[PDB]
């Protein structure tokens, strides 16, 4: 909907190179606000956004205590998985998991999320009702039976509906000057002939936030989406993003093409033409 | 704030 919080856990076993490594990052919408890495000298939770640093010392000690324990739990999970699939302790394996809550335009919990992957594939997932699971395979069903017996879905539903929502709001306020302030994209069209017959029109959008945006090339007001070449929205490095759309058009028809830009930061949807 | 405690896979 309007706002969200996410955590991204990555655990990788590395036989011979040491113990399984655990990394965690936290996002509010598209702003990373904290990180944890077990490979550090003396691992600690660390700020990745100035506004989170309003939290007292107790906050960071507490978070570190948690990510420290996750390090162990996932090492134990990597073992279990290896068991589930009958794999040697010689191969390297990864566990990934992303969970979090979504807010509506009015601070209400829209829906919750929790998914685990094994070697970059769907493994297990908490369903929309936050009371059931969807296992990907026979191995995942073993985890499910334990989690059903352990009542994990109930622990999450209480979190996604409770602490996750309270604290997401808490951050939106504490950092409203950067989280709720939308940065409109700077735009402009470019033209580049490919031959004597055709030419490329490219529509730019830069320095924008959040990352959610819609660049669509129209020919006579009709979206040429299937013909529009997009690139993955990318990080400018300053917390704002970049993107461009491109189309190959015939020479002389250039003026029948408009570029529309939709973004939370734009009062009204922009319309752009190549202006030689 | 992260999930307080992780369940074992």
């Amino acid at each position, epitope marked *: 909907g309007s706002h969200s919080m996410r955590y991204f856990y990555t655990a990788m076993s590395r036989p011979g190179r040491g113990e399984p490594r655990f990394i965690a990052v936290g996002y509010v919408d598209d702003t990373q606000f904290d990180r944890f890495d077990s490979d550090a000298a003396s691992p600690r939770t660390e700020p990745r956004a100035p506004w989170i640093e309003q939290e007292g010392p*107790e906050y960071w000690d*507490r978070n570190t*205590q*948690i990510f*420290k*324990t996750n390090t*162990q*739990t996932y*090492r*134990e999970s990597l073992r279990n998985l290896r068991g589930y699939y009958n794999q040697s302790e010689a191969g390297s394996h990864i566990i990934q998991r992303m969970y979090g809550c979504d807010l509506g335009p009015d601070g209400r919990l829209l829906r919750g999320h929790d998914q685990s992957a094994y070697d970059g594939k769907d493994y297990i997932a908490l369903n929309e009702d936050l009371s059931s699971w969807t296992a990907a395979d026979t191995a995942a069903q073993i985890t499910q039976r334990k*989690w059903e017996a*352990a*009542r*994990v879905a*109930e*622990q999450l539903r*209480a979190y996604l509906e*409770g*602490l996750c929502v309270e*604290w997401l709001r808490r951050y939106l306020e504490n950092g409203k000057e950067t989280l709720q302030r939308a940065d409109p994209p700077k735009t402009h069209v470019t033209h580049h002939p490919v031959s004597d017959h055709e030419a490329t029109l490219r529509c730019w959008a830069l320095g924008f936030y959040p990352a959610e945006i819609t660049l669509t090339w129209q020919r006579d007001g009709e979206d040429q989406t299937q013909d529009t070449e997009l690139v993955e929205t990318r990080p400018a490095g300053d917390r704002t993003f970049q993107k461009w759309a491109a189309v190959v058009v015939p020479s002389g028809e250039e003026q029948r093409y408009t570029c529309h830009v939709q973004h939370e930061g734009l009062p009204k949807p922009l319309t752009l033409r190549w202006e030689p | *704030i992260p999930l*307080t*405690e*992780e*369940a*074992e896979l």
Partner: T-cell receptor
Amino acid sequence: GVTQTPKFQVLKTGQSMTLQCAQDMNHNSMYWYRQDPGMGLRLIYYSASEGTTDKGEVPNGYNVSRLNKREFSLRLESAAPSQTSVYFCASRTRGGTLIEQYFGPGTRLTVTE
Amino acid sequence: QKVTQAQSSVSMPVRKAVTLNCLYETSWWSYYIFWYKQLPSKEMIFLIRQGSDEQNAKSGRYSVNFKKAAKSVALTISALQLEDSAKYFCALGEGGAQKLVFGQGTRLTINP
């Protein structure tokens, strides 16, 4: 479930001794509590897994070792009369809602001069 | 001071019901409360758990009055049997990997 030996013990001041604990339940978090005559329980050491041990409300005079996941041992080192107490081992699952700790029968320990 | 049980010992006629008080102190955003009952043999048996974000817990004859704001979590035992005679402990479990701080216990005596 969670077995603990010895169940009774007497010590002369300045003695070392080890209490043994093993949980047959496949739990992950283990604890060593100490209960004085009229008081309640207080944590000494605990461990989230093997190779990792943490304090500890009153860790002084005690060392500990999680030699593996099923077993968690405690030591007295230099027995002192003030260390007379009932030492409880504890085990519990992580994740989900059934996170209560399960105690062993206990170890009544008197230390005499 | 972290966990306080205001009654050192309480007497009750059989068949009735009794409430045992327990007040705690925590700055944690996630915790649990546990009620245990200790036998003369020192054996420590588990009774009921109360989550920080849970409805009032009820497990058979054991029920809990969770007053999150006042940080009060009094236990109530109904239909008092004579086995109920024991020492009852209220334990705070804040975590994480939760290291319990125990009340100092209440002595429950059921009269015949």
